Design a protein around this ligand. Structure first.
Ligand SMILES: [Cu+2]
Length: 178
């Protein structure tokens, strides 16, 4: 269990807006993930397997841990944070740092549709961090090159594959890319 803390994942943004807008208004916006941003857990093997299209952001309800709130997708719904093209760092916080096989990072394609549910064919692989089966917290932060050929509203998906289970944690990040 864990989530992307910087940039602020959508899941962690829900936990953050819990504090600023309260439990009910934040749960209306994000669903039950506000309490458990670390629990966006679904089957590993993305993109060939893993959570189905339209259930990527919620990891198909996080293995029963959350609802499907995160799967809403419109131009306006989610809080965007600014990021620049090029090298960026992605830092996870672990509540329970499991043995890790890899992390893998994707961005939305230049022509993606911000008002339809997320599908795996809107995402492009941008980097893979292999790991030696040790705990996730031996490599907290990853240096990933974000494409410099697109701008405006994009989603970075970070995926954390657990070494010793059939599961993975899916963290979408809403970004305004410049
Ligand atoms: Cu866990």
């Amino acid at each position: 269990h864990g989530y992307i803390k910087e940039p602020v994942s959508r899941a962690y943004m829900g936990a953050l807006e819990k504090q600023t807008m309260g439990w009910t208004a934040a749960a209306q916006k994000y669903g039950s993930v506000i309490d458990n941003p670390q629990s966006v857990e679904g089957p590993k093997g993305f993109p060939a397997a893993g959570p189905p299209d339209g259930r990527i952001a919620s990891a198909n309800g996080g293995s029963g841990q959350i609802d499907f709130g995160l799967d809403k997708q419109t131009a306006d719904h989610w809080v965007k944070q600014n990021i620049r093209g090029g090298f960026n760092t992605f830092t996870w916080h672990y509540t329970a740092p499991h043995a890790t096989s890899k992390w893998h990072y994707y961005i939305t394609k230049k022509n993606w549709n911000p008002n339809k549910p997320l599908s795996r064919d809107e995402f492009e692989l941008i980097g893979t961090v292999n790991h030696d089966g040790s705990k996730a917290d031996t490599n907290l932060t990853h240096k990933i090159f974000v494409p410099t050929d697109r701008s405006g509203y994009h989603i970075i998906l970070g995926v954390w594959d657990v070494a010793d289970t059939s599961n993975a944690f899916y963290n979408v990040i809403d970004v305004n890319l410049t």
